[PDB]
Nucleic acid binder design. Structure first.
Ligand code: K
Ligand code: K
Ligand code: K
Ligand code: K
Ligand code: K
Ligand code: K
Ligand code: K
Ligand code: K
Ligand code: K
Ligand code: K
Ligand code: MG
Ligand code: MG
Ligand code: MG
Ligand code: MG
Ligand code: MG
Ligand code: MG
Ligand code: MG
Ligand code: MG
Ligand code: MG
Ligand code: MG
Ligand code: MG
Ligand code: MG
Ligand code: MG
Ligand code: MG
Ligand code: MG
Ligand code: MG
Ligand code: MG
Ligand code: MG
Ligand code: MG
Ligand code: MG
Ligand code: MG
Ligand code: MG
Ligand code: MG
Ligand code: MG
Ligand code: MG
Ligand code: MG
Ligand code: MG
Ligand code: MG
Ligand code: MG
Ligand code: MG
Ligand code: MG
Ligand code: MG
Ligand code: MG
Ligand code: MG
Ligand code: MG
Ligand code: MG
Ligand code: MG
Ligand code: MG
Ligand code: MG
Ligand code: MG
Ligand code: MG
Ligand code: MG
Ligand code: MG
Ligand code: MG
Lengths: 89, 44, 273
RNA sequence: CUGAUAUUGAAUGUUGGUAAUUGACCUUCUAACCCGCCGCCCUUAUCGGGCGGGGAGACAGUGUCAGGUGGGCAGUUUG
RNA sequence: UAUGAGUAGCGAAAGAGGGGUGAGAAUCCCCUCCACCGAAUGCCUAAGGUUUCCUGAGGAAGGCUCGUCCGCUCAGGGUUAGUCGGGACCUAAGCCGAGGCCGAAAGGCGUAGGCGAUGGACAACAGGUUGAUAUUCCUGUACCACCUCCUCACCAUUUGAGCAAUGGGGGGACGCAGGAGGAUAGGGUAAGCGCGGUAUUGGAUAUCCGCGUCCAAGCAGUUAGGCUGGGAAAUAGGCAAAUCCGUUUCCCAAAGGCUGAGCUGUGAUGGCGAGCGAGCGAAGUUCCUGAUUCCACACUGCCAAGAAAAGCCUCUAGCGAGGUGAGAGGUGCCCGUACCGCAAACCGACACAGGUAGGCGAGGAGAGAAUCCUAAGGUGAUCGAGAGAACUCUCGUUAAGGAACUCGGCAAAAUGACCCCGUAACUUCGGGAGAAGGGGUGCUCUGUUAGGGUGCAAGCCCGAGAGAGCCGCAGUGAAUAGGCCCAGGCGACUGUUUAGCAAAAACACAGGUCUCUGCGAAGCCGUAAGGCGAAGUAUAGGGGCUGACGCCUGCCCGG
RNA sequence: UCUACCCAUGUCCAGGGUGAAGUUCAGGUAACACUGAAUGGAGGCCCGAACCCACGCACGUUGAAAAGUGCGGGGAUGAGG
């Protein structure tokens, strides 16, 4: 599989922005991607050194638009901590 | 007072779930009937 | 001996127990234990097929040597132990070659006694021989019906059978019941009365003690309703009110003989009880 | 529960029609059938099967037919 | 869509005022005092729910009123793990079940083998931090498994180190009760120490007042202690083999090991810490008390005789030319993680007086988790304002009388704690019995009594029984806490039962008796296979009747 | 998933009392019996919270609740929850 299949998009929030001060980058990842695959993919794509990857699953949020109930997608969020001697993403 | 429905997801699945239904002829007729009626939910 | 408790409560009044004088250890041989779950009188369908069975104390099975097939190797009685699975006590035998087995404890037997199986053994309490080798009038127990199958008859506390005569292939044996019966002369028996002879005198004393032994209450038929039992119903108390007393399944239950007519073993039964 | 008959064979006397032929009965045999007995093997298996012993044995079990019993259960009647 | 009707109701509970916000305020926010829970109405956490969590905005509907608010609407946001719980580990009941057995069909049963926690096994702790997660992030300090580009030491290349089973053995491995220890958590703040304060209501620099008064896993050491006796030789057994286990013989007798709460040191030149004001930061000891926890089912006793399997250890069978140990470097996946969880978020159609397993559960007085008042902490309850009629409900009191009431003392009243005295018939000799009936009970001084615990002492803690006084209507001054007796029927007894109109004299029961059952038992379930009975075997099992115990249990076999 | 019974595996039960067998010592006898004291800690034992139950009354009866609440009540180491 391609590394760029693994990382989907960056998470841009206040929390994510605060973690970037600590050299921690938050990505949404493929819901099938284990944290080793994420580590490998971040090093491959961005040419950085990864200290650790923490990873969590979000359920879909129930949603309404008028008379139609449904569900947002499940998400897998990875917080990637780079090593202290490393280039920034 | 203890009422009759005491929820428990394991027991729900084991008694009424898809694999329970599939494990007997009569459970497979339930699924056929519910597909025939066009139910959105075939099983617990 | 039987220990009578003092009437310190209504529960305890009349209650008696074994003193367990014969028992020499409190700990069974771990290598001869096997697991034993209760069944509640329920069969493979999960249905109750025997009434009044349920609960009671958890028990481990002690694997008894009913076959007595270590011929010629002497064994020393190491213990006499409580067995929860049967009325008799059991004896751990240390065989000379390092094998350990349990046997039914005969009346008399002592720690240190040597026992021996096989056709060239003495007629001593605790030995086991083919019935062709046992003299007439010998009191025996743990009698086989099929060569090699193991002892089936006369195993309960205090029971005994006497060898009456020899008819070549068969030996006559008076069983505990008093039935005289032909047994194949190749079938083994063990010498002596089974021990724990006082077992029958125990007064259980209270309802709860029956419950500890896995007995659930018996409800009489005559206090059931007609849909439950032939004796059910009637306004107020009623007599049996039927030609015969009846079982719950509508057979006569007082005098009606239930041994199968055309039983194959009828030829071997000389005198019925 | 009981009989007949099939599965079901081999001998031995015995006693009914028929002086030499057929039924009934008793006993014995083993080879069918049975084994909730033992050893071995398939096999890491208290299932099953095979093989060898042992027990039992033409009985039992089972099929068909028959009589008895049978509120255990069923359908009903009880102007 | 009416009527009933502006009626019944608005679902247990303490608020008051000041300030604010706003179109609008009893109801939202803040402040102050007051009040309620406190073996919970607190903290944690199941199951279940599934975003209800946080922030900002909103007010149509939902909310029994209102609403600026909200578990509601709309936007955004929020759940971080080698070590926690689950999986990549183990098995129980049970379930599935290759072949197989049985059966009109469908199927039923069942072996090997699996699945299956509610159990077994198993490596991380303290502190800090966000609006919203935290043994998960951060800091500090660890541990476990595995790997080898490397380093060092050691051993050995076929009488050859080492590894070693999917096999053997050991172990894991187990009940209930009781009491003694040892310890710790927790508690008291007793002493000491530290910081702050000296009052304006008469008094107090005082035996004055308030607040605080420590700390992990890990590593090293030690320990109350608890378990086991130990060596050598020989071996009809442990499916094969064992140098292991079992057995025996001989020798020796306190050694050995195996565990062990906790403690000491280190961890910590750190952290926390009254308070001062994100920072900064004092003292941080001793004494007393003390578990329902731990050592630990350890011990003792008892009968009703108390899972399995793996991890683990060991043994050989094997494998085997490279191994073993210690560093150093490195690797470590998935699932859950928000929030509610005695509740307005779960089960009850409701923001419903009901139900909901488990862990922790402070102080005073107390035997106590009772009780009353409080702590930590939580809460003031989603309609209000008046008025203070009948009547109804829940409470309090009541002259004289005291069951006259009534089917019936129903209801209520009375009794009630501790210590002491004393206690009948009858009895199965246990009981009856808290029988009954009486007495004492506060406070002060003697007095830090005698005496006891702890300690080297100082001290702290427990503490009779006396004597002398003092006060009240009343001293277990509140809350909580048996009414008792005489005689009879029924059932011996503790139990059980008509969920939701019957708790009983009914059922059960221990005991009695009859009867069936010789083991492929009888009986029972099933068409059968297969089962229960029972891994039982006549001192056992099934069925009927009777129902502790005592004395007894007559006559009739014609039906 | 309520409920009846059963099976496997967990767990809960503040406190207080009474004082069975046994044991020890003393006495006691030719031996035993037997007696006393201490010890000991039995029990479907006792009192009593949690918990479980549901006896009486009142209230409720278009309920706060399609079985409850209040005040009393019973069991509370067991045939227990
Ligand atoms: K009794
Ligand atoms: K009965
Ligand atoms: K009747
Ligand atoms: K309370
Ligand atoms: K708002
Ligand atoms: K884990
Ligand atoms: K640890
Ligand atoms: K330490
Ligand atoms: K969390
Ligand atoms: K009844
Ligand atoms: Mg995670
Ligand atoms: Mg019975
Ligand atoms: Mg009836
Ligand atoms: Mg009938
Ligand atoms: Mg009748
Ligand atoms: Mg009558
Ligand atoms: Mg009929
Ligand atoms: Mg009809
Ligand atoms: Mg009006
Ligand atoms: Mg009005
Ligand atoms: Mg009106
Ligand atoms: Mg009115
Ligand atoms: Mg009104
Ligand atoms: Mg209200
Ligand atoms: Mg909120
Ligand atoms: Mg409104
Ligand atoms: Mg785990
Ligand atoms: Mg099956
Ligand atoms: Mg098949
Ligand atoms: Mg579990
Ligand atoms: Mg762990
Ligand atoms: Mg939170
Ligand atoms: Mg949380
Ligand atoms: Mg509620
Ligand atoms: Mg409960
Ligand atoms: Mg308290
Ligand atoms: Mg009056
Ligand atoms: Mg008066
Ligand atoms: Mg009157
Ligand atoms: Mg009158
Ligand atoms: Mg009354
Ligand atoms: Mg009664
Ligand atoms: Mg009762
Ligand atoms: Mg009722
Ligand atoms: Mg009930
Ligand atoms: Mg009632
Ligand atoms: Mg059968
Ligand atoms: Mg069986
Ligand atoms: Mg009766
Ligand atoms: Mg009677
Ligand atoms: Mg009579
Ligand atoms: Mg009791
Ligand atoms: Mg009680
Ligand atoms: Mg009550």
């Amino acid at each position: 599989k391609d590394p760029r299949d693994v990382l989907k998009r960056p998470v841009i929030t206040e929390r994510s922005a605060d973690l970037m001060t600590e050299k921690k980058y938050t990505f949404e990842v493929d819901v099938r991607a284990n944290k080793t695959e994420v580590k490998d993919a971040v090093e491959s794509i961005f040419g950085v050194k990864v200290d650790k990857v923490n990873i969590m699953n979000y359920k879909g949020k129930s949603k309404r638009v008028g008379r139609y109930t449904g569900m947002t997608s499940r998400r897998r969020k990875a917080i990637v901590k780079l090593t202290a001697d490393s280039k920034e993403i | 007072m203890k009422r009759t429905f005491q929820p428990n997801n394991r027991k729900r699945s084991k008694v009424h779930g898809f694999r329970s239904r599939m494990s007997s002829k009569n459970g497979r007729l339930v699924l056929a009937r519910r597909r025939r009626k066009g139910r959105k939910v075939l099983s617990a | 001996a039987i220990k009578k408790y003092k009437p310190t409560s209504n529960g305890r009044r009349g209650m008696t127990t074994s003193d367990f004088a014969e028992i020499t250890t409190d700990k069974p041989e771990k290598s001869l234990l096997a697991p034993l779950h209760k069944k509640g009188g329920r069969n493979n369908q999960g249905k109750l097929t025997v009434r009044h069975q349920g609960g009671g104390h958890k028990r481990q099975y002690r694997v008894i040597d009913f076959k007595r097939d270590k011929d010629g190797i002497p064994g020393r009685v190491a213990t006499v132990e409580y067995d929860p699975n049967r009325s008799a006590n059991i004896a751990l035998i240390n065989y000379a070659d390092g094998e350990k087995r349990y046997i039914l404890a005969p009346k008399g037997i002592q720690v240190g006694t040597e026992i021996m199986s096989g056709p060239e053994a003495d007629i001593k309490v605790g030995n086991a021989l083919p019935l062709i080798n046992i003299p007439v009038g010998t009191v025996v127990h743990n009698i086989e019906l099929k060569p090699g199958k193991g002892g089936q008859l006369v195993r309960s506390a205090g029971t005994s059978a006497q060898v009456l005569g020899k008819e070549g292939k068969y030996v006559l044996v008076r069983l505990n019941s008093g039935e005289v019966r032909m047994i194949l002369s190749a079938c083994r028996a063990s010498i002596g009365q089974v021990g724990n002879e006082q077992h029958e005198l125990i007064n259980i004393g209270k309802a709860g003690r029956s419950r500890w032994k896995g007995i659930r209450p018996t409800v009489r038929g005559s206090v059931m309703n007609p849909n439950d039992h032939p004796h059910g119903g009637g306004e107020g108390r009623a007599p049996i009110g039927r030609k015969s007393p009846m079982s719950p399944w509508g057979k006569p239950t007082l005098g009606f003989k239930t041994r199968k007519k055309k039983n194959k073993s009828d030829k071997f039964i000389v005198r019925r009880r």
